[PDB]
Each structure stands twice: as structure tokens, then as C-alpha cells.
Design a binder for this molecule. Structure first.
Ligand SMILES: Cc1ccc(Cl)cc1N1CCN(c2ccc(C(=O)N[C@H](Cc3c[nH]c4ccccc34)C(=O)Nc3ccncc3)c(F)c2)CC1
Ligand SMILES: Cc1ccc(Cl)cc1N1CCN(c2ccc(C(=O)N[C@H](Cc3c[nH]c4ccccc34)C(=O)Nc3ccncc3)c(F)c2)CC1
Ligand code: HEM
Ligand code: HEM
Lengths: 439, 439
């Protein structure tokens, strides 16, 4: 029945956000140490944020359903991006069905042809941008382009890509991102006020929706769009085109940076001299494969590539925190978290806990969690990442294709520092220069 | 450049509405006479209402497009009934397309099978409610039920009627009507405020929309619904189900009372002793026909029934006024009507003008307008009634079927007085008792 200890209220407005941008790990470790507790509370903009910082308590955070811990209220910022009535802006039961419908479309049973479609786009991109025997590139910009290109080949039909290509898509998604006020998570009063950038992203989304309508009419005269319009709710009705447009935008938005960042970190580690052992170990795994790879190879026959990916996400999780609004009080350890808190779990913090991942700064693909449930890079339980399998697939295929055909050398002594200022954390951009060399 | 004369401002709030409910014709005639002008203005709730009361000026009222005289703003009351984004609540160009799409569905080319489907429902209703050799009924209640029953057979598919029958439909439409504040036409400030009855009609419409969704999914696994979902806008997109649900509700709403009232008046006149000449004349026309009538009979071979219907609408038009918001000043006669007026034309007033219809109180199906364009019972120009042909069809078929098989006697000396208190004016309810006699 104890309230968690409270790191007492600071004066600068949203001042803890500045600390989360500079040294989030060290900050949350200091709170843990100095309050002598794995569960503690900070105040951000008058909003109590209770951080669950002990991996043994993960199940208490990820288990409860929306009737008790709800993410809807924390992601009010995305409502102009995905649309009213879509995903988290929808009532709990319609929301639940919508997410499941998108998940049905990203199950491993749907990746027939994805590996080739991906390998083809990767090969295309390397042909168009990495022409020389040798050259310098920014790995992070380049993986980004590969991720959106590959996503579009796998997911969109030939007629859709003709009308709206991957470069126009990345732009829309990048423009929408830039309209967000990530700190408004702690300023719900602000989101009740008219914002002009909200209307602009609504107008942009309307134009995309008009394009998807024109295509459906044309088709009516199997890809992601076509799959979602086949969906039937339990009440026997279909998703509206509005709702479908919305879920497509959520799909793409989610993956743009996280998968980019994950591909990039994984490559940055593999190419580093200090990790020649793992690179040789990856080559022993993938040199076995035919040129034109297949679903079976990447999915079923790449366990060690998967580890390299996992540990990159372990060491440098792209989403630093996972958050809910407590709609009814919840037990955590010896504490009770009261109604109205934001309750948060931190993959960064739990991935750097010395008990769960001894020597946490060391990238080591052959480690395993010493605390069961501690790895939460793709979340857990009810709200577990539904794109995990696609993202792994994309990223593994890109790793194999790229490393089979080129070597890479980082143009700096140590692996990039993560840059924590951004919504999705990745390696610092101007530290990602890389020399490539065709084999 | 003259402003029309202004009937100067009265004090009781919305007090002229009370006069429009008791003696609208006499009131507008007094304004015309006493201001010595066919074009004059009254003030209702601070809103200037400029009435165009000379049939020679009809073209100046009905010709201009929405960029100049707009009905959207006057029918803000219907937005909870038909939905946001639907009909008049839609932007002028989408609105224009929507109305046309409904009109495409009610062209004479679509009435294959309508005459039988109608005659079958009429025969059914007479079998179930007029069983005796002789009995008493309220004609107005009974035509009402026939109009909605027939409409549903003609317009809805077998699978739709199974799931939502004509009695549940009439109820929904009657509940929605009863949520309206017809005087809020002159109280636009009121419609900007939350009204609880607005939410209730939105909830009821959602339930209808869910039903139409369930059916489309079932079908996907030719009637009005099916026709509208085939529609393609100029930009190559489809109407949403929301929009389609809305237009169906507008379709049905429009016809419930107007067609009922028109059938009822026409019968009330025909059955009256004073009009035996016209009844015999109708019989000479329809006794020629086979029992199971057809499209060709009613459409192509009933000119005199049509006249009887027209003159009933001439004498007692169901919609007393037609209205627009002046969005840019317009010339009318020697006057100019300024931006921001409601400009109105009155079928009642123009149908009772002695120059246009000499001896206007006399029902006489063999008269013709002495002023070209004076008959406006179904409007004119751009906003001409798009259900006119269906309504005539329904009403003619009901007249033939009913009069071939029964005689009728009104249980009172004179034809009913119209009751002007209602939104759609018809004959006074408790004056419509009628004795029927099977032939
Ligand atoms: C500073 C701080 C201190 C303490 C605490 Cl408890 C919290 C904070 N932050 C709260 C605000 N932050 C962020 C950071 C990143 C995001 C973010 O990129 N979202 C997008 C859009 C999105 C939000 N939901 C979703 C659910 C499904 C799909 C997309 C979204 C995103 O692609 N997500 C993402 C991607 C992939 N699979 C899951 C989620 C943010 F919405 C707030 C960081 C700091
Ligand atoms: C007292 C007064 C004095 C002076 C002046 Cl200028 C005006 C007024 N009135 C203004 C308010 N009144 C009314 C009377 C009746 C209606 C009415 O039943 N509408 C329904 C719903 C509706 C409105 N638009 C439509 C357009 C298309 C389809 C439906 C609607 C109606 O089925 N329509 C109707 C039926 C058939 N085909 C055309 C219109 C009203 F909406 C206000 C009368 C007095
Ligand atoms: C490396 C790539 C990705 C990472 C690291 C990642 C990480 C996560 C995490 C941590 C969560 C849990 C958040 C929480 O509990 O609040 C999550 C949820 C989610 N992710 Fe991702 N994600 C990735 C890619 C994707 C992709 C490609 C999609 C594409 C659709 C996606 C869609 C989602 C959705 C919908 C959820 C929420 C499910 C729900 O709330 O029911 N993610 N992701
Ligand atoms: C006796 C039956 C009917 C009468 C007397 C009648 C009368 C009228 C009148 C006078 C107008 C013109 C209003 C104006 O200019 O503002 C009109 C318009 C209209 N009526 Fe009717 N109507 C009847 C039946 C129907 C039916 C069955 C429908 C079914 C859909 C319908 C739909 C409409 C529509 C949509 C318009 C407006 C068109 C536009 O604004 O573009 N009406 N009607």
C-alpha cells in the first residue's frame, strides 16, 4: 500500500525532458539508486510519471488490459497523423480489432515473396548509389531509404507503387513526424487546443486517402491495402477506407525509423574490427546460401543473424520507454501506483540492468537475458510489437544481401554514440560515415 | 438598386412563425398588398427574410447557382439527421455530385418492376387493414403506411427488408423528424450549441449504418443501396458507406410526408361528391387497364391522373416555402436583395396568385398555369425535386389500384382544411375519416 517514492518536484518547466535527451540511462539510474527503489516517480509538467525499473516486475506492467492500463491517452499526439477513430483514437474494442487486423497482415504466413522483393530492392539501391569499387556513404541515411523501399515492395501492389512511390511516401511520413510535439505527452491541455500543423497533416492524409480510393475503384473494375479491406469486424461490418488509410500510415510510420536504426546499429557493430569474430561467424552462416535467397533461408536458417539484431536492440533500444495511463490503481512490487499516473517501463533501463545483462555496454550477440522477461525491445504481453516479424525479416535480408556483396569500414575509431534527443533513438547521424568496398 | 420594402420589426420573438402556422397565405398576401410590392422583407429573429411573391420573378430565384444563392446554411437543422459531410452539409462540389448520384437512382429508367412491386404492397395492405365490405379509416395514416411500404419494396432489396422492415424504418424517420427544431432556421446561433437530441439521432443513424454494412459484407460473400455504392466521383473515388447511409435516409425522409400528403389530398378531392365528373373521368382512364398494371400504363398512359395529382399539389403544396441564403447580392424585379438575407419563394403564395391560377381555391385538374413557371410545387431549375418522378409514380399507382377496387366517402361535408402548423403541410388529421366500400 506504499506510494512509490517521489523524486520531489523540480521547477524548470518540463525540465526532466532535457535530462532524458542528454543522459537518460544515468538519470533513471540515479533516481533508482538515490531513492533506493526500482519503482519511483518523477513529475513532468504536473504529470506524475512512475517508472518501473526492475525487470522482475515486467509482468505487472505488460500484463494488464486497457480497462486498467491504457495507452490511448498517452498517444493523443498521433490522432492527427493516423486519424480520428483509428488505432488508439478508437474505442478500446474497435481499436483492439483494428490492431489485430494489421497484425493478421504481418504474420509470417504472409511473407511469401517478401525475401526476393526485398533482396531485389536492396540490389537495386546498391546498384544506383554504391557504384564504385569503393566509396563513402552515411549508413543511417542509406539504410533508411532501403527500409522504406523494401517495405513498399513487400507491402504494396504494383498499381499502388506506380501512383505513390517510396520517395513520396517517406516524405509524407517525415513531414508528419515533424509536426509532432513529443513533449505534449505531458501536456494534454495543449492537445485540446487547435494546432495549425494538425490541420496540415489532416489535409495531407486526405490526399493519400483519395489516392487509395482511386486505386480500389480501379482494382474493382492481396497486398496490405487489399488485405485490410477484406477484414470483417465481429459485428459483420468492414473497415472504412478512412480506417484503412489510417492503419497503413500507422504501419509505415512505426517502421520508418525503428527498423532503419536497428539495421544501422547491427551493421555498425558487425563491421567494427573489435567484432571480427562475429562477422566471420555471420559469414559462416550466410555464405552457404544461394544468391537469390528465400523465405526459408532468412526465417528458418539464420539464428545468429537474429541474435546480432536482437543484441543491437538490446544495447540500444530504439524506443527508450513504454508508457501507460493508469486507469485503476495497480500493484507493483511493494507499491501501489495510483489512478492517473503515467506508468512506464524502460527498455533502455531494463536492458542496462547489470543483473539482467551483465556487462551491459558490451555488444555480445551470444549473451542471453539473466532475468527472464528482461528483454522488452519489442515490448511484451497484450501490446507486444506486431511488426516484430516483418522488421526482423526486412533487417535480416538486408544484412545478408549487403554483407555477401560488400565489406564496410567505419570512418571513426568507436561505434557511434546514440543521440537521445530524438523520438526514436538511433546512432548519431554525423558519426555514421562508412567506406564501402565491393567484394 | 432599391432595397425591398421592409415590414417593420415586430417584438414577440419569432412571432411571425405563429402567423405562418395559422394563416400563412393571408399573412403573405397582406404583406404584398400593404407594402404594394411582390417582393418584400420580414424580420424573424433578427434574420431578414425576403419573400419573392410574384410568379413572373421565379426565374431570378431558381436560376442562380450555390456560389450566389445557397441552401446549405438554411438546412443546418438536418445535419444530425443525414450526417456530417452529407448532402447540404457537404462542400458545394461534393454535395452537387451526391445529389446527382441519388437522382441517377430515381430516373424513370430505373422503375422496371416498380409498378408491380407497388401494386403488390398496396394490395397486401388493403387485404390486411380493409377486410370488410365496408369500414372506416383515417386516410392520412393509411396512405402514410402505404407510401413507406411501397417505397421500401421498390427501393430495397429482399435481403435489406428482411433485416430492417418498413415499420422500423418509418419509426426511425418519425423519431428523427421529432428531434428537429424547424424554427432554428431563424436561430443559427442555437445550432452551434450542443443539443442532446442531436446525439440521439446520430446514435440511431449509426445503428442503421451498421445494418447496411452487415448487408454489404453479406452480399459481397442493383437496389438503391447497391446502386449508390457503384457511384464514382469525378476524382475517381467512391462514396463512403457513411455518405451512402446518409443519402438513403435523405431519400426516405423527403418522401415520407410529401408523397403521403399528395396521395391523400388527391383522393380526398376525387371522392368528394362535388367532383363526380373527375372521378368518372379517372375511371374512363383506368378501367381500360389489366389488373396487374405495368410501367407503361402508369407512366405513359395516365395523363389525367397526373393532372389530378398536380392540382392537389397546386392547391395545397406540401412545402409552403423554398429558401436560400443570399451569398452575393441579387437582382429581383426593381429591387436588390442584399448579402445575408434569406430569400424565399412560396409555392403556396404563387399557387394562389389570381393571375396565375384564376379562382385558386377551386380544385380543377383541367386548369393550366396562366403564368409560365408559376407552378413550383416541386421547385425549379438547379434545385428541382429529384424525387418528383418516383413520387408521381408511387402516387399514381396507388390511386389506380385503390380506386379500381374500392369507393370512398368522406365522413364530413367539405374537404379537409390544411393544417399549417407542421413542417410539411397536409390535410388536418382528425378531418380525414373516410368510409371505404369494396366494389
Ligand atoms: C522523455 C520521457 C521521459 C519519461 C517517459 Cl515515461 C517518457 C518520455 N517520452 C515520451 C515521449 N517519447 C516518445 C518517443 C517516441 C515516440 C514514437 O516515435 N512514436 C511513434 C508513433 C507511435 C506512437 N505510438 C505508436 C503505436 C503504434 C505505432 C506507432 C506509434 C512510433 O513509431 N512508435 C512506435 C514504433 C514501432 N513500434 C511501436 C511504436 C513517441 F510517441 C513518444 C519519448 C520520451
Ligand atoms: C415559417 C417560415 C416563414 C418564412 C420562411 Cl422563408 C420559411 C419558414 N419556414 C422554414 C422552416 N420550414 C420548414 C418546413 C419543412 C421542412 C422539411 O420538411 N424539410 C424536410 C427535410 C429536408 C430539408 N431540406 C431537404 C432537402 C432534401 C431532402 C430533405 C430535406 C423535407 O422532407 N423536405 C423536403 C422533402 C421533399 N423534397 C424537398 C424537401 C423544413 F426543413 C423547414 C417551414 C417554415
Ligand atoms: C525494430 C523495429 C521495431 C521496434 C524496435 C518496435 C518496438 C515496439 C515496442 C517496444 C512496442 C511496445 C510498445 C508498448 O508496449 O507501448 C511495439 C509495439 C508496436 N509496434 Fe513496434 N517496433 C518495431 C517495428 C514495428 C513495425 C514495423 C510496426 C509495423 C506495423 C510496428 C507496430 C507496432 C504496433 C502496432 C505496436 C503496438 C501493438 C499494440 O499496442 O497493441 N512496430 N513496438
Ligand atoms: C410530393 C412529393 C414531393 C414534393 C412535393 C417535393 C417538393 C420539392 C420541392 C419544392 C423541392 C425544391 C426545394 C428548393 O428549391 O429548395 C424539392 C427538392 C428536392 N426534393 Fe423533393 N418533393 C417531393 C418528393 C421527394 C422525394 C420522394 C425525394 C426523394 C429523394 C425528394 C428529394 C428532393 C431533393 C433531393 C430535392 C433537392 C434537390 C437539390 O437541392 O439539388 N423529394 N422537392
Amino acid at each position: 500500500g506504499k506510494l512509490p517514492p517521489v523524486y520531489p518536484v523540480t521547477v524548470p518547466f518540463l525540465g526532466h525532458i532535457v535530462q532524458f535527451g542528454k543522459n537518460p540511462l544515468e538519470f533513471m539510474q540515479r533516481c533508482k539508486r538515490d531513492l533506493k527503489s526500482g519503482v519511483f516517480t518523477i513529475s513532468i509538467g504536473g504529470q506524475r510519471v512512475t517508472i518501473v525499473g526492475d525487470p522482475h516486475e515486467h509482468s505487472r506492467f505488460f500484463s494488464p488490459r486497457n480497462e486498467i492500463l491504457s495507452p490511448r491517452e498517452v498517444y493523443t499526439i498521433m490522432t492527427p497523423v493516423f486519424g480520428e477513430g483509428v488505432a488508439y483514437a478508437a474505442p478500446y474494442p474497435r481499436m483492439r480489432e483494428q490492431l489485430n487486423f494489421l497484425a493478421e497482415e504481418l504474420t509470417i504466413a504472409k511473407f511469401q515473396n517478401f525475401v526476393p522483393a526485398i533482396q531485389h530492392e536492396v540490389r537495386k539501391f546498391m546498384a544506383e548509389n554504391w557504384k564504385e569499387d569503393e566509396g563513402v556513404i552515411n549508413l543511417l541515411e542509406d539504410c533508411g531509404a532501403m527500409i522504406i523501399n523494401t517495405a513498399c515492395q513487400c507491402l504494396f501492389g504494383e498499381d499502388l507503387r506506380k501512383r505513390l512511390n517510396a520517395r513520396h511516401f517517406a516524405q509524407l511520413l517525415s513531414k508528419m513526424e515533424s509536426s509532432l510535439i513529443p513533449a505534449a505527452v505531458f501536456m494534454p491541455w495543449l492537445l485540446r487546443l487547435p494546432l495549425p500543423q494538425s490541420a496540415r497533416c489532416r489535409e495531407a492524409r486526405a490526399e493519400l486517402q483519395k489516392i487509395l480510393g482511386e486505386i480500389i475503384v480501379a482494382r474493382e473494375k492481396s497486398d496490405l491495402l487489399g488485405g485490410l479491406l477484406k477484414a470483417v469486424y465481429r459485428d459483420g461490418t468492414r473497415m472504412s477506407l478512412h480506417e484503412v488509410c489510417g492503419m497503413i500510415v500507422a504501419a509505415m510510420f512505426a517502421g520508418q525509423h525503428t527498423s532503419t536504426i536497428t539495421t544501422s546499429w547491427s551493421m555498425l557493430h558487425l563491421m567494427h574490427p573489435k567484432n571480427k569474430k562475429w562477422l566471420d561467424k555471420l559469414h559462416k552462416e550466410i555464405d552457404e546460401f544461394p544468391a537469390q535467397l528465400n523465405y526459408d533461408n532468412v526465417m528458418d536458417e539464420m539464428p545468429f543473424a537474429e541474435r546480432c539484431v536482437r543484441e543491437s536492440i538490446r544495447r540500444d533500444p530504439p524506443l527508450l520507454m513504454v508508457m501507460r495511463m493508469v486507469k485503476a490503481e495497480v500493484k507493483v512490487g511493494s507499491y501501489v501506483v495510483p489512478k492517473g499516473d503515467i506508468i512506464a517501463c524502460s527498455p533502455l533501463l531494463s536492458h542496462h540492468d547489470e543483473e539482467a545483462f551483465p556487462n551491459p555496454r558490451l555488444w555480445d550477440p551470444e549473451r542471453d537475458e539473466k532475468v527472464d522477461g528482461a528483454f522488452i525491445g519489442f515490448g511484451a504481453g497484450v501490446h507486444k510489437c506486431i511488426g516484430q516479424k516483418f522488421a526482423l525479416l526486412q533487417v535480416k535480408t538486408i544484412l545478408a544481401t549487403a554483407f555477401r556483396e560488400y565489406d564496410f569500414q567505419l570512418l571513426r575509431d568507436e561505434v557511434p554514440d546514440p543521440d537521445y534527443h530524438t523520438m526514436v533513438v538511433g546512432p548519431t547521424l554525423n558519426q555514421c560515415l562508412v567506406k564501402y568496398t565491393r567484394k
